[PDB]
Amino acid sequence: MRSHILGKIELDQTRLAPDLAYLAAVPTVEEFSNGFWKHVPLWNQPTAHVEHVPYLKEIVTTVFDGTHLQMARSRNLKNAIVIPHRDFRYFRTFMVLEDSPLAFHSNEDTVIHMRPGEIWFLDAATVHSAVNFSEISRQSLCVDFAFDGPFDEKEIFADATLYAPGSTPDLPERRPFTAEHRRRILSLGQVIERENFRDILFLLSKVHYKYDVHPSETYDWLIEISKQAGDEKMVVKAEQIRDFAVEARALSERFSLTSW
């Protein structure tokens, strides 16, 4: 199902500053990851954190519910990109808590800029990605819901007035993706090496946020760049990464992005 705003609660800045202070300092425990990302599980039965610097506690308790919501966590990301990929009826809500301008999300053909307070529905089964082109903080609250007991996206709210499904979204404009531009991306066939394969993967993954092209093409480009490079082991690895990212196809155990 396509991504869309479910509603939009207003956020009490000062009442919420100390909660972000906490979350930023909580240490939590320690692949295809880059940059800074971080999670603080809030619901999993609460956690030692809930009580710790509240407010969000209120929100997830005053805004949502129903006998089932199987999760909840903070989720920050600075100067990072998570490559496009599908995770595999498992609802999932996302709410950014602060103003981070160069922070975006993508899902199949769309690119969105979440604003403070909006509650978005995101689908796990589709090809998605997230990014932060800058170091400005982007703390978010994420709440997943449990179903297969037939629903209406309204019934995730404990109070149905919060539900406002028509708020318009910030959909960034993207430049047309020309054929000249595709050929230039293929020019990386000249410079890709096994020691920078991973770096190129991350670079290609960024293109769709600015240009009008499906993000799954990231993988087609990488495979072609690989063939242009004449490196057979690279071609094979770029094909496995693509089968893993858009096909959920399990990657071998011992599979390594940096040991060919």
Add this chain to the structure above:
Amino acid sequence: MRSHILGKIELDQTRLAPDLAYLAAVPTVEEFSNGFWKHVPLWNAPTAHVEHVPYLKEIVTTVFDGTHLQMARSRNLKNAIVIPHRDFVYFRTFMVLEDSPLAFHSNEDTVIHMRPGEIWFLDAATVHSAVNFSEISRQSLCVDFYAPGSTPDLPERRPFTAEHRRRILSLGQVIERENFRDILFLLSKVHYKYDVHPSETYDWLIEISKQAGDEKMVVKAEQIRDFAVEARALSERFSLTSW
């Protein structure tokens, strides 16, 4: 006392709530110390912490002149007591950031109750102590490198009599090697409430140890008094738990 107020500043208890929340959750990890204490390095002679503490950062930046700013950190203390000592035989200022009613500092012959925002100078050369008789947070900004006549809260202590001294030496009937430390910390607290020089803590401990008839206790007490009152260094073989 050689310590005194250096001029207040009133804290914006709203830009400060989040910083306090930051300082309280960060991991930091860390002999005569007991209870709860935690320090957050801010400026060493600047850290990943400074920018997540916007307001605190503003204050050390503009209220202070770095033309000799050695360093600054945050120091918290709950149900804790720093035994009275003199550091040796620089310039330290201290600013409590929260109202913790049962948190006190003492120096030579007076006891102080720092109120939020005041900027104090604490002398390291004379016998000093700090304590928090409760759990109420007492987050403080310590900056090591203007209104002096400001009136400080200098609690008024009760008279320390010979009768009280005697009750105190009754501890000689219960001291044991396993509660020696506890009694040290208990004794260290008397001067906050009673008008008696903090150093006398060590004289009671020594007199208590002698009445106990435990020579290893007497020698230990002497070592603590020399370390605390005379700044003599203890061995690395020294311990309050290993006899």
